[PDB]
Write a protein that binds this ligand. Structure first.
Ligand code: P00
Ligand code: P00
Ligand code: NA
Ligand code: NA
Lengths: 383, 378
């Protein structure tokens, strides 16, 4: 079942980690619009970037570059393995470009028959026909007519299964370093390094979808940096624009040459993403993400001590998953709705897992107040 | 291109050296109210202080208001918002497929589309697009897409059957040489879709939101599609898009779905201006100003075989002597200080602001005449 807000919960205003609806009810936001508003609502630096670029230039076509795109590209190139950056609007679009690029690179550099894409059960990569087919939930890709072929799914974290299906006809392995929608499941170190080794062996490209786990979410700028495994292609969105739709596909010159250092990028979007990048990619903010994770986790542990609802607390940085015990299997939506009644916005990650993806700069006072509200909601659900 | 735009106001653009250009390209028919239009800047700033983002779990006031405006003004009863034309087309094509699957048969999957069509660059949309060069080389394409020539109603009749789920068409093919559907072709598509229980999908990403001098091209033609997509002009430069359909069709998936609050506030302001008698009338006045200049340029330099399009989507096809050289005129245009487009290597394309000042039409077309003069003087 999808989760939709009823007619009496329409957000009208946000500031920091607080949201107000049409009736003026105030909520603490631990959801971030699904890990998008990584610097909270109407952050003054992002508002300033939006307004100043908004007076100057909003739009160029892909025929032109613009100063905000150039500056953002340079920032991303300097901070990561990337040598080339392509900007788009959404994570779905960035993933489309990544997957097409892996396919095309294989086609032109090796063979038109080198087409297999390996992906993982419960993966989420977007809702376009190609991306949802690479995604690992057949319920979401069924019912749209013929899917793009040569996509093979195996279980996340099953390196043996990857080894078994990979071959010289394989062009890519596509993986979320942490599967956000798929129960907040993190890759193990041996699995992710194994993917890098298998891609090297088969001359396939390793594609990291960091749309959800990138741009500071894990407490490193990108999850790949936490793991110390470098992909061939990486995608980023959501937190990248802090609520403004923007995305990026990062790769090397060698790979991008199959298709300056940057291509595309809406001037307004890139100005906002530049401001977001400048704040997130700091020692102070990245350290604070770790401090804040532990504040949330301690609250979740306290709730569990009182109410006995969780079997596991997991995730990385400020992507937090809390798996419900068997006695509460399927109840994630109910805790989410009770949370909203109590004035706190949370997420699910499937029907058995609570998910939290607050602003990376969420104030300690908001953590405590929001988690008190969530405790109150838990009390109502399990009374 | 050989310059970097840094600032725009209306239909004038400045580069890093402060060189002033006249913009007849609109970032490819996107900045339909020109650069930094004060109403759009005001909407951006006001919503930008209030709320930028909601997930698809929620709606928001700008999305509800924009949905209402589009529903009241068009055949639509339901509106789904996305970021780009590509995303809106993905949603439209998936919806046509899914509707056929659940309302008729899982085997009802054929999509009919047209040679030279452009629908976006995602794997699915580029495969529905009609330029094999752009869909080749990405591995297995989504199947059950058949292409026939644009404007060939006989060919559509021949390929359509009970296993057909959709006909996808741009009422005017912008990228494909600025070719307009004939009335009998477009009406014919509606009749064949009715006969075969298929959905007629109009891609109005380029020709919609006032571009033709009607709010949507379907209104010009008087042929109502089942699904329509809109983007580009809809946000005036802010990335936003919409898929418009009926309740009966949308139910295969309240009245709106999705929509970025900031994007929808900007698009609401854009909609309010474009959907006015005066702006829509002006589009026709201005088209004739452009066309008169193109005619005078042809009288002096003898370079065009045809001037076509609708409203402020203008195509000027080059004579056989200049075939393949549209890029040469585009570059000479830029040197002369005017930003124009191509529509393939044989066609010049113009897609200026719908409110482009007459002074800018005359100045930009004088610069374009200079560019043409330079190219022809050899
Ligand atoms: C790992 C990962 N990859 C790709 C995407 C798609 O990015 P988007 O198009 O920017 O939403 C996402 C986006 N998730 O957003 C929640 C889902 C969304 N509400 C939807 O179903 O479209 C993601 O988490
Ligand atoms: C009829 C029609 N349908 C869909 C699209 C795609 O819209 P977009 O994703 O908003 O660019 C377009 C976009 N055209 O943009 C011009 C070319 C484009 N920038 C490219 O190179 O992909 C269109 O004209
Ligand atoms: Na680098
Ligand atoms: Na209507």
């Amino acid at each position: 079942l999808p989760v939709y807000a009823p007619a009496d919960f329409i957000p009208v205003k946000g500031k920091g980690s607080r949201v107000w609806d049409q009736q003026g009810k105030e909520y603490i936001d631990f959801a971030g619009g699904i890990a998008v508003t990584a610097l909270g609502h109407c952050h003054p630096a992002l508002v300033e970037a939006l307004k100043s670029q908004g007076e100057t230039l909003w739009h160029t076509s892909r025929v032109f570059t613009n100063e905000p795109a150039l500056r953002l590209g340079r920032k991303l190139i300097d901070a990561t393995f990337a040598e080339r950056v392509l900007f788009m609007n959404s994570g779905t679009e960035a993933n489309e470009t990544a997957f097409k690029l892996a396919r095309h690179y294989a086609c032109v550099r090796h063979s038109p028959f080198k087409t297999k894409i390996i992906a993982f059960h419960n993966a989420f990569h977007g809702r376009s026909l190609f991306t949802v087919s690479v995604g690992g939930q057949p319920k979401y890709s069924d019912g749209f007519g013929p899917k793009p072929a040569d996509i093979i799914h195996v279980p996340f974290n099953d390196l043996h299964a990857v080894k078994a299906v990979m071959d010289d006809h394989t062009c890519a392995v596509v993986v979320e370093p942490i599967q956000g929608e798929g129960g907040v499941q993190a890759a193990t170190p041996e699995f992710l390094k194994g993917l890098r080794d298998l891609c090297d062996e088969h001359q396939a490209l390793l594609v990291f979808d960091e749309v959800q786990c990138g741009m500071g979410r894990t407490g490193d700028l990108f999850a790949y940096m936490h793991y110390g495994v470098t992909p061939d292609i990486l995608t980023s969105a959501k937190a990248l624009g802090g609520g403004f739709p923007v995305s990026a596909m990062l790769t090397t010159q060698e790979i991008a040459s199959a298709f300056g250092s940057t291509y595309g990028g809406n001037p307004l979007a890139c100005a906002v993403a530049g401001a977001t990048f400048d704040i997130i990619n700091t020692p102070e903010v990245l350290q604070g993400i770790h401090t804040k994770r532990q504040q949330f986790v301690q609250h979740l542990q306290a709730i569990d001590e009182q109410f006995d609802i969780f079997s596991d607390i997991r995730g990385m940085g400020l992507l937090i998953g809390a798996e419900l015990k068997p006695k509460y299997k399927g109840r994630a939506r109910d805790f989410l709705y009770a949370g909203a009644e109590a004035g706190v916005m949370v997420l699910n990650a499937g029907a058995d897992v609570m998910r939290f993806a607050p602003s990376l700069v969420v104030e300690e006072a908001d953590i405590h107040e929001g988690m008190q509200r969530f405790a109150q909601a838990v009390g109502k659900v399990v009374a």
